[PDB]
């Protein structure tokens with residue numbers, strides 16, 4: 001709760017289990033990691049008074065997903081921008097000190113109404129925590145490219161599992 | 168409309184633009200391609216009488232996404248199983264003979280209530296086309312692993328763009 005911003009090296013440390021400890025929430029490592037930095041994280045403020053994350057991914061034409069998606073028509077997969085928002089809600093649960101392994105549980109409405117091209121510079125993620133309740137978080141999120149909102153997600157859900165025995 | 172099943176080599180040909188032609192719907196190439204085969208595609212039957220796709224992805228412990236997602240806790244990303252369902256709805260629009268480039272436009276409710284582990288053998292996707300209406304398709308979908316339903320998506324939307332001038 002004391003650290004309110006994270007560098008890429010902090011996120012890579014998180015991906016090895018060395019930020020929140022083994023058996024606790026982990027970001028993916030490359031090439032599934034869809035965040036370079038967490039600019040802001042808090043458990044107060046945001047749209048619902050329950051905290052907020054702002055994170056960034058730098059874009060350059062050589063990122064792996066442009067060449068295969070699609071050949072002659074490069075565009076960052078919508079599913080990976082959506083996954084960044086699940087990655088951030090999971091990070092929030094870990095950052096609050098909750099134990100267990102993170103899984104996305106789904107979302108209400110997702111809309112893709114724009115695209116990240118290899119000429120873009122920066123994708124920004126805004127997450128508004130709605131409720132924390134296994135331990136799970138519900139959040140709304142946007143994805144923006146160079147100032148332009150392009151995706152929205154309502155009711156993003158991520159849970160932490162300490163025991164899967166009964167499921 | 169004459170071909171009702173597709174091999175991996177057919178899907179790779181689709182990913183190069185050589186199945187539906189340049190400027191038309193393309194599957195991603197590896198490593199974003201989340202389908203090995205289309206077992207069944209039709210424009211009649213399915214849950215709503217508007218056709219159906221059944222597709223498969225073989226699972227083995229060496230698939231790239233297991234090592235990075237997550238370190239010491241391998242699980243196929245939920246976002247990639249969801250993306251397979253968008254990939255299949257886009258394939259359906261191309262298979263019907265519609266021109267233009269495919270984009271996911273989003274979904275209503277997505278639920279992840281199980282997981283694909285590196286011990287699994289086969290993921291199966293079931294897509295029920297709800298409505299075709301730019302040209303877009305609305306569908307419901309499930310992801311199953313070795314017979315067990317693990318994800319559901321309602322209101323998957325994919326559109327084809329012949330012109331982006333006005334957007």
Ligand SMILES: O=C(O)c1ccc(COc2ccc3c(c2)CCC3)o1
Pocket residue numbers: 075076077078079112113114115116253269270271272328331334
């Ligand atoms: O992975 C995808 O299918 C994906 C990524 C982003 C999108 C959304 O694509 C869009 C969505 C809306 C518009 C455009 C493209 C250009 C014209 C307006 O789809």
Ligand SMILES: O=C(O)c1ccc(COc2ccc3c(c2)CCC3)o1
Pocket residue numbers: 086102103104105161164167242243244245246279280281282283
């Ligand atoms: O990429 C993900 O976060 C992801 C993939 C699949 C899931 C869902 O994870 C789940 C969802 C439900 C259950 C388990 C795991 C084991 C106990 C029951 O989340």
